[PDB]
From a paper:
The RNase III enzyme Dicer-2 associates with its partner protein R2D2 and cleaves long double-stranded RNAs to produce 21-nucleotide siRNA duplexes, which are then loaded into Ago2 in a defined orientation. The Dicer-2–R2D2 heterodimer has critical roles in both siRNA production and siRNA loading onto Ago2. The present structures illuminated the detailed architectures of the individual domains and interdomain linkers of Dicer-2, which were not visible in the previous cryo-EM reconstructions at approximately 7 Å resolution, and revealed that Dicer-2 comprises an amino-terminal helicase domain, a DUF283 domain, a platform–PAZ domain, two RNase III domains (RIIIa and RIIIb) and a carboxy-terminal dsRNA-binding domain (CRBD). R2D2 comprises two dsRNA-binding domains (RBD1 and RBD2) and a carboxy-terminal domain (CTD).
We determined the cryo-EM structures of the Dicer-2–R2D2 heterodimer and the Dicer-2–R2D2–siRNA complex at 3.3 Å resolution. A structural comparison of Dicer-2–R2D2 and Dicer-2–R2D2–siRNA revealed that, although their overall structures are similar, the central linker becomes ordered and interacts with Dicer-2 CRBD and R2D2 RBD2 upon siRNA binding. R2D2 RBD1 in the Dicer-2–R2D2 structure was not resolved in the density map, suggesting that RBD1 is highly mobile in the siRNA-unbound state. R2D2 interacts with the helicase domain and the central linker of Dicer-2 to inhibit the promiscuous processing of microRNA precursors by Dicer-2. In particular, R324 and E331 of Dicer-2 form salt bridges with D288 and R223 of R2D2, respectively. A structural comparison of Dicer-2–R2D2 with DCL3–dsRNA suggested that Dicer-2 recognizes the 5′-monophosphate of dsRNA substrates in the 5′-pocket and cleaves the dsRNAs 21 nt away from the 5′ end in the RIIIb active site, consistent with a previous proposal. The modelled dsRNA sterically clashes with the helicase and CRBD domains of Dicer-2, suggesting that these domains undergo structural rearrangements upon the binding of dsRNA substrates.
Author numbering:
A (entry chain B): 95 to 120, 127 to 164, 188 to 210, 216 to 310
B (entry chain A): 8 to 24, 25A, 26 to 253, 273 to 344, 352 to 425, 436 to 538, 554 to 581, 582A, ...
């Protein structure tokens, strides 16, 4: 069931909806243009050709669910064409709203924590902000001129957010990025 | 008028030069032509008169561009000495060796400053120094230091300096233009030379009308916004962190550019710049290997996204593509521009308005395109009137090419263009030229103001209030500069005789003499690229003195050099005259006078048309056309038929000798159950014989066929000689003949009567029994086969008991429920009896309820019968029963079987006897009638069957191209950004080697036998009888052979011989006159008339063999009275038809003893003929049906010409070319001169060393690649000289040799294909031949063998069209791909395949032959050149394009009778097909459609 699988990788990977159209009479050529990328699969039957083209489109789009479970918790993504049926993807311009496009509840905790100044606000203010947003920090050192060693913090999201700063202020920049984006 | 390029090249050849060409990118063609006009000494060594050239450039990268360009466009060896190659520290030894190998030394000015300054290469050694970007050479510069080297060296031995520049003065130095330009002239030792401002080249510096002008103001932002500072600070924090690293500079540059775009073009436009930066950084992050480098590109992206989030949030305060969001958040500059665009472009005529906006950088263009599209779309006032586009990695180039064309075509109205530092904007004249970013260079000002070309057009320039005064000052300085450069350049720009009356009294005037010369130049054969015109040249003082005395000392003389295609080749020197005008007028008069005298102009002084030239030679060569009533100077036919000479008057008499040639049928199959009845019976010694008064030659052994198997027929060479001793024995013979065709095999029609007059086909067939003798008892008893009467039961009682011997081999028919079906008694089943049950008395009785009575005999033998076939045509590949009931003709089984095969042996023999007659005649004429294998000792070989006969540029396509991420920034889905990466990396889809190097790899001699038979008479083989029979057998006859394969060799040879004959006889003609007279000397009509005059069309095998409805049997004819009437009255003949003839119903005496029809029957017949016309089916052409009766055939005008060609083919194959040439004067195609024999056409004359060698610079490499070394290199020179070559006055064009060459190639290729491809049908051989001698298959080989580097031409078009083709082919692999075949050619009226490339290959083939004069050595070259393409095309033959269109599975050809309709991805698309002739037009339309189908 290639049509179903392609429709899925499209809806799941946050790619746009695939549109399959066969036009030649004779024995059938399917032109599918998921996202201005058009590949042609031609076979004997109307229904049969579509399947071949869908593999062709799938192969190119795939080439480019353990992680997804977490992200599903943080967003209202449908996660299946049918789930979309259950009831126009992200463009390169609108990816800037990742953290910002999140569940009112987790952020509302983070917004309160980052604004609130009631504790040992060192890495306990930053950790709180991210912990509410279900975020794990992959902290790592710089590779040269390590005076007040810089840390490269990578968060576990599709956006691939990596923040670099001085040891003392790495903990302040995390707080700042989060503030601006939410 | 000659193009600026050619005139510039002439001026540069005459004197030093600085070519200032602002636009058109034609600097390269001029650089290449000058380099070629000074290349007569690039071969000689420096030790004795050698000379080399230099191409000094400012930059190494520019030098690479110019070295590659020289190698591609020239046959000159090119060295590339650039300082980075450790070219420094070179000993005199090395600079000596490198000037020995290379000729055009291309490099950087520093390398050659050192070379010339040190005594390494003297300026005397140089013929031409070309300096690129000559503006740079001012004050202290390697260019200026080089020219001072010139000012110290010995004079009278200094090179020709040709500087090239597009920007006359360096940027912003505008103070004293005049002084700077004078200094530049003094430096390069020669005046600047530029073209005027006309249609062909738009000059920027010399345009007069100036556009209306506007300067617009905008104030400083009242408050800097907060997000501008914050975004600025965050990029500072990033700069500190990334500074601590390990590439880094590029990441920094992009962020600094963004900052520029943000401050100068506004907050909103930054929202479109950050999307651009994200794309770039992502592409790069993927293009990495070290994880740490990738880390820099990842952290940058995270900042970019924070930026888009921030910059967007500010706008969000008010999709944010609304007019009121672009307006409120934009630097006052952009607010002014957006309003100014809106108010001005309120004419609202999309087609009328055209606006060019110039911006500072590349990224700016990207961002402003974005801002403009989103403002326009959201603004009701501008939307639908304004469409934007931006003009500024291999894929990147193609996208811009589409954008520039979109603006030029007129789809897009606005073009945002980046800075043009040293180049001219290449767009049409705009209307409102806006400059958003301030002008920084004079070149920017002149190039920009240049685009506004009408007074109506406006030039608007945006400057801030504070800088307004300073800009008003610089614009006045840039306007004064323009007006000064303009005057200096204005000076330096590229700008009564009595009549003669002919004998007739027409008057040539010296005014029209140029017009008449131009018409004569339009007549001579020219390429699609354009006509060639005469070349005028004023003579300098030294020449005037040498040619003429004090007569032209103070006077001017101009010479006119006619094109080589014109007959006149000698230069005509004009009258010594007072003015330049009386020089040109006189030169023209003198040329027209000489052309008239050479018979190239009518008595009315107007060049002769092709028709008039043909009319003069029409009587000389086409005289025979007159009798038939059709003349050369502006279907089918009915011919009689003649039996062979041996069959005419062959009726045996009753007092003379009679020859019986017994016919021996020999089965060639295996005995089985199926064929046992066939083998034994056919081999029985009871054969029939052909009895005739005349003797017969030795006839070949023909293959007949049958259901069982093939069998061989052999008429015996020796005749048993017998004399008839009676007149009743003759009647026995005649009656037995009548009864075979009347009864044994029914071929009888009511009209048929025995033909007792000898007349035609009068031979007899007689039974023969064991030596041998005529069977006289069989003849008596079977005068008429008895009727199957059958009988009654009581009658059946008295019948004697059947005896075994009685029915051993005889023939029987079943009386129960059947009519006249004869069957052969294979064996008597004596052992079994009627009572026995079958694996039976009842079986038969039940089967015929009343038809059979009770059997009289309970016990008897039962006969086994195998029925006999009903078909009388044989050329193309256990019913045990009761005896009492079957009727027993006593006829032998032995003969009945053989006589079924008789009608098809008799027909084949008629035609084989015609074949022997032709053999003898031709052999006698060629005087080979005495050779021992052609004499009385000739023993012919069997007919053999032809088993072959059926009877027996980028790799990616359109849809795979990624979207431009740049032109669609705000709506590119993240998926594409990944596709772009892989596709670009290709995951989804030199100075030591000479240009003329043939790559050693596989793309994709054994002597011709005809050329061995031509040289040695030992190899000659006998012209066989089967070959002449195949050569007269048309394909419609449905036989085992045909004239089609021999016709290919015959047509090839007839075209070669006509070419050689016309080229030798008339050697002062053009290809145009020679190719027309040839195409009319080998035309179907000429050949048809020739064959009709030779009487060959009557003796032809063209009509199928339906032995019953379309055949009169030998010795059996129509009633003599009726046959006389048909011939006597042409009027009745028309009405005499099938229905009338069948009603005659002759019987007994009328159809046997008495020949003539009875008077009553005659009356019945004539009344019948009148009735049809007066009643119904009147005026019907019953000619097909009743032609067979009177002996007439209808043959098309095609088969007759094909037969002539096939006879020529037989002669060529068996006797070589010289004996075949004699045949062409036999048919009176080629009239033969007394002075020059026809046979010696091959060796007939088909037609200073140092001068010839000058044109052929690296001919060693041409000869090495061609495989033939030229002794007389005058043939090489003429093979290479395009008609557009002014310097080659020694020889003529390539056009004379191509004529001779296309014939030598066609003939040799065809002989090879015939001899080696004998398993391919004649249709496939015609296709393989037409696809091996195409003009696109020859152009591919010419490029493959690198022979196009030596073509001598100076045409702009031809050179571009040759380069596009060679670059196409270099990628294709140098193979004849489908795409090359679909490319448009010159013949199909935009040309992709230049014709010149292919004619030059044919001419080189001709030149090879004229030097060697050996068709064997001409073949060794042709084979080596065509060996790769012969192998591939034989494996898969290239189909006619018609076939590709018709056989397009998805597409449906719809030709109009030639517009063609087709289906591409099922979209209705029709492309018009054009062509002068419908047959050629059909192909042409297909090709166009096929390209269109690929276009999809």
């Amino acid at each position: 069931d290639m049509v179903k699988e392609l429709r899925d990788y499209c809806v799941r990977r946050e790619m746009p909806l695939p549109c399959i159209e066969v036009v030649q009479q004779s024995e059938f050529v399917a032109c599918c243009s998921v996202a201005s990328i058009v590949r042609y699969g031609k076979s004997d039957k109307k229904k049969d050709a579509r399947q071949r083209a869908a593999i062709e489109m799938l192969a190119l789009i795939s080439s480019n669910e353990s992680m997804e479970e977490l992200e599903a918790l943080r967003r209202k993504k449908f996660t299946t064409y049918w789930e979309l049926k259950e009831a126009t993807g992200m463009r390169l311009c609108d990816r800037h709203n990742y953290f910002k496009n999140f569940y009112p509840t987790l952020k509302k905790e983070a917004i309160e924590a980052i604004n609130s100044d009631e504790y040992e606000s060192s890495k306990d203010k930053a950790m709180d902000v991210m912990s509410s947003l279900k975020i794990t920090p992959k902290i790592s050192e710089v590779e040269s001129s390590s005076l007040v060693p810089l840390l490269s913090v990578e968060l576990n999201c599709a956006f691939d957010v990596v923040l670099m700063a001085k040891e003392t202020d790495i903990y302040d920049h995390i707080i700042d990025y989060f503030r601006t984006m939410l | 008028p000659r193009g600026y390029q050619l005139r510039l090249v002439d001026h540069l050849t005459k004197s030093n030069g600085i070519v200032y060409l602002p636009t058109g990118s034609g600097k390269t063609f001029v650089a290449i032509l000058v380099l070629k006009r000074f290349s007569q000494d690039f071969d000689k060594p420096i030790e004795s008169g050698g000379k080399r050239a230099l191409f000094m450039c400012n930059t190494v990268e520019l030098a690479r561009q110019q070295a590659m360009a020289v190698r591609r466009c020239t046959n000159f060896k090119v060295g590339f000495y650039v300082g980075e190659q450790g070219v420094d520290d070179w000993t005199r030894g090395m600079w000596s060796d490198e000037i020995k190998k290379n000729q055009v030394l291309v490099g950087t000015a520093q390398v050659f400053l050192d070379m010339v300054t040190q005594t390494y290469v003297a300026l005397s050694s140089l013929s031409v120094v070309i300096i690129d970007e000559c503006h740079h050479g001012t004050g202290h510069h390697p260019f200026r230091e080089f020219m001072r080297l010139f000012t110290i060296a010995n004079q009278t031995k200094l090179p020709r300096v040709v500087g090239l520049t597009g920007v006359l003065i360096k940027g912003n130095e505008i103070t004293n233009v005049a002084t700077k330009l004078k200094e530049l002239e003094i430096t390069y030792r020669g005046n600047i030379i530029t073209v005027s401002d006309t249609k062909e080249l738009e000059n920027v510096m010399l345009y007069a009308t100036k556009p209306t002008e506007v300067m617009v103001s905008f104030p400083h932002q009242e408050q800097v916004l907060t997000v501008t500072r914050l975004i600025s600070a965050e990029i500072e924090k990033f700069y500190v962190s990334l500074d601590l690293m390990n590439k880094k500079s590029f990441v920094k540059q992009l962020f600094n550019d963004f900052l520029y775009q943000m401050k100068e073009y506004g907050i909103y436009a930054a929202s479109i710049a950050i999307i651009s930066l994200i794309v770039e950084f992502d592409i790069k992050r993927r293009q990495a290997e070290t994880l740490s480098v990738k880390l820099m590109h990842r952290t940058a992206l995270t900042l970019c996204e924070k930026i888009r989030h921030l910059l967007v949030q500010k706008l969000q305060d008010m999709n944010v593509n609304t007019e009121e969001v672009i307006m409120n958040f934009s630097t006052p500059k952009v607010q002014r521009f957006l309003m100014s665009l809106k108010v001005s472009f309120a004419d609202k005529d999309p087609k009328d308005i055209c606006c060019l906006v110039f911006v500072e950088r590349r990224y700016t263009c990207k961002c402003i395109y974005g801002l403009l599209l989103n403002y326009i779309q959201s603004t009701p006032e501008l939307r639908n009137v304004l469409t934007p586009q931006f003009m500024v990695s291999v894929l990147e180039r193609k996208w811009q090419k589409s954008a520039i064309q979109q603006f030029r075509d007129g789809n897009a109205n606005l073009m945002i263009c980046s800075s043009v530092l040293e180049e001219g904007i290449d767009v049409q004249a705009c209307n409102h030229v806006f400059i958003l970013d301030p002008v920084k260079t004079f070149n920017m000002y002149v190039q920009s103001k240049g685009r506004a070309r009408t007074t109506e057009a406006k030039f608007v320039l945006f400057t801030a209030d504070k800088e307004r005064e300073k800009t008003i000052q610089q614009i006045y300085q840039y306007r004064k500069a323009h007006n000064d450069i303009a005057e200096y350049l204005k000076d330096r720009v590229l700008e009564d005789i009595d009549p003669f009356t002919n004998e007739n009294g027409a008057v040539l005037l010296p005014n029209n003499a140029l017009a008449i010369l131009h018409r004569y130049c339009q007549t001579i054969p020219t390429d699609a690229f354009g006509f060639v015109i005469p070349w005028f040249h004023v003579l300098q003082e030294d020449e005037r003195d040498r040619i003429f005395g004090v007569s032209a000392k103070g006077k001017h003389v101009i010479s006119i050099n006619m094109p080589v295609n014109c007959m006149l080749r000698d230069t005509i020197y004009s009258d010594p005259m007072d003015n330049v005008k009386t020089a040109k007028i006189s030169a023209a008069f003198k040329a027209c006078k000489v052309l008239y005298s050479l018979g190239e102009l009518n008595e009315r002084f107007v060049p002769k048309t092709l028709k008039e030239r043909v009319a003069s030679i029409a009587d000389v060569h086409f005289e025979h056309w007159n009798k038939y009533g059709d003349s050369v100077t502006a279907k089918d036919r009915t011919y009689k038929t003649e039996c062979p000479l041996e069959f005419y008057d062959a009726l045996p008499r009753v007092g003379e000798i009679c020859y019986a040639y017994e016919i021996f049928l020999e089965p060639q199959f295996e005995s089985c159950e199926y064929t046992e009845h066939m083998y034994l019976n056919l081999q029985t010694p009871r054969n029939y014989a052909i009895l005739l008064r005349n003797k017969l030659p030795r006839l070949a052994e023909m293959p007949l066929f049958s259901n069982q198997g093939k069998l061989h027929v052999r008429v015996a060479n020796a005749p048993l000689e017998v004399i008839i001793q009676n007149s009743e024995q003759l009647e026995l013979l005649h009656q037995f003949h009548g009864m075979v065709f009347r009864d044994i095999l029914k071929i009888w029609h009511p009209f048929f009567v025995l033909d007792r007059r000898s007349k035609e086909n009068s031979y007899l067939v007689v039974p023969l029994i064991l030596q041998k003798c005529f069977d006289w008892e069989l003849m008596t008893n079977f005068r008429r086969l008895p009727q199957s009467h059958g009988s009654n039961v009581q009658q059946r009682e008295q019948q004697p008991a059947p005896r075994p011997e009685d029915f051993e081999g005889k023939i029987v028919t079943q009386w129960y429920a059947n009519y006249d079906k004869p069957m052969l008694v294979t064996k008597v089943h004596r052992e079994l009896t009627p009572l026995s049950y079958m694996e039976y008395y009842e079986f038969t009785m039940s089967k015929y309820g009343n038809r059979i009575g009770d059997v009289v005999h309970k016990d008897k033998f039962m006969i086994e019968v195998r029925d006999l076939t009903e078909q009388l045509t044989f050329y193309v590949h256990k019913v045990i029963l009761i005896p009492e009931l079957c009727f027993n003709f006593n006829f032998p089984g032995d003969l009945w079987l053989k006589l079924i095969f008789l009608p098809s042996i008799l027909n084949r023999m008629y035609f084989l006897l015609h074949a022997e007659a032709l053999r003898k005649r031709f052999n006698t004429y060629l005087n080979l009638h005495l050779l021992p294998f052609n004499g009385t000792d000739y023993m012919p070989r069997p007919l053999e069957i032809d088993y072959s006969l059926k009877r027996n540029e980028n790799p990616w396509q359109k849809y795979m191209e990624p979207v431009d991420l740049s032109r669609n920034l705000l709506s590119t889905y993240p998926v594409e950004l990944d596709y772009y990466y892989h596709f670009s990396v290709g995951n989804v889809c030199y100075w030591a080697k000479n240009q003329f190097h043939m790559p050693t790899g596989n793309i994709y001699v054994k002597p011709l036998l005809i050329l061995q038979k031509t040289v040695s008479k030992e190899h000659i083989t006998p012209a066989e009888q089967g070959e002449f029979l195949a050569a007269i057998t048309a394909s419609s006859a449905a036989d085992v052979f045909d004239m089609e394969r021999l016709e290919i060799l015959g047509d090839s040879f007839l075209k070669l011989s006509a070419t050689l004959y016309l080229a030798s006889k008339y050697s002062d003609w053009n290809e145009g006159t020679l190719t027309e007279v040839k195409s009319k000397l080998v035309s179907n009509r000429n050949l048809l008339f020739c064959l009709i005059d030779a009487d060959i069309p009557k003796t032809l095998n063209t009509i199928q063999f339906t032995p019953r409805y379309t055949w009169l049997p030998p010795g059996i004819s129509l009633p003599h009275n009726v046959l006389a009437l048909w011939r006597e009255n042409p009027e009745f003949a028309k009405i005499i038809g099938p229905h009338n003839l069948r009603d005659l119903a002759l019987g007994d005496e009328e159809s046997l003893v008495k020949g003539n029809c009875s008077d009553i029957n005659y009356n019945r017949f004539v009344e019948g003929c009148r009735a049809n016309g007066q009643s119904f089916y009147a005026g019907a052409d019953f000619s097909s049906e009743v032609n067979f009766c009177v002996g007439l055939v209808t043959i098309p005008n095609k088969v007759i010409a094909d037969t002539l060609e096939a006879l020529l083919g037989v002669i060529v194959k068996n006797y070589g070319l010289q004996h075949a040439f004699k045949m062409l004067e036999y048919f009176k195609i080629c009239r033969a001169d007394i002075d020059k024999p026809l046979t010696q056409l091959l060796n007939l004359e088909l037609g200073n060393t140092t001068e010839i060698d000058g044109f052929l610079i690296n001919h060693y490499y041409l000869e090495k690649n061609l495989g033939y070394t030229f002794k007389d290199r005058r043939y090489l020179l003429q093979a290479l000289t395009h008609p557009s070559y002014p310097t080659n006055r020694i020889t003529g064009s390539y056009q004379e040799l191509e004529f001779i060459g296309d014939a030598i190639l066609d003939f040799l290729i065809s002989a090879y294909i015939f001899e080696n491809n004998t398993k391919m049908n004649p249709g496939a051989l015609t296709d393989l031949r037409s696809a091996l001698v195409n003009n696109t298959t020859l152009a591919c080989i010419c490029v493959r063998h690198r022979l196009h580097f030596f073509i001598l031409a100076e045409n702009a078009k031809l050179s571009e069209i040759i380069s596009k083709f060679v670059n196409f082919q270099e990628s294709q692999g140098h193979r004849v791909t489908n795409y090359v075949r679909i490319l448009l050619e010159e013949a199909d009226v935009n040309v992709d395949v230049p014709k010149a490339l292919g004619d030059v290959l044919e001419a080189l083939i001709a030149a090879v032959y004229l030097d060697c004069r050996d068709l064997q050595r001409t073949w060794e070259v042709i084979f080596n050149l065509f060996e790769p393409e012969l192998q591939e095309f034989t494996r898969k033959v290239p189909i006619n394009h018609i076939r590709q269109l018709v056989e397009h599975k998805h597409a449906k050809p719809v030709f109009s009778s030639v517009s063609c309709q087709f289906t591409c991805m099922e979209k209705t698309i029709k492309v018009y097909g054009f062509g002068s002739n419908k047959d050629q037009a059909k192909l042409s339309a297909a090709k166009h459609a096929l390209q269109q189908l690929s276009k999809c």
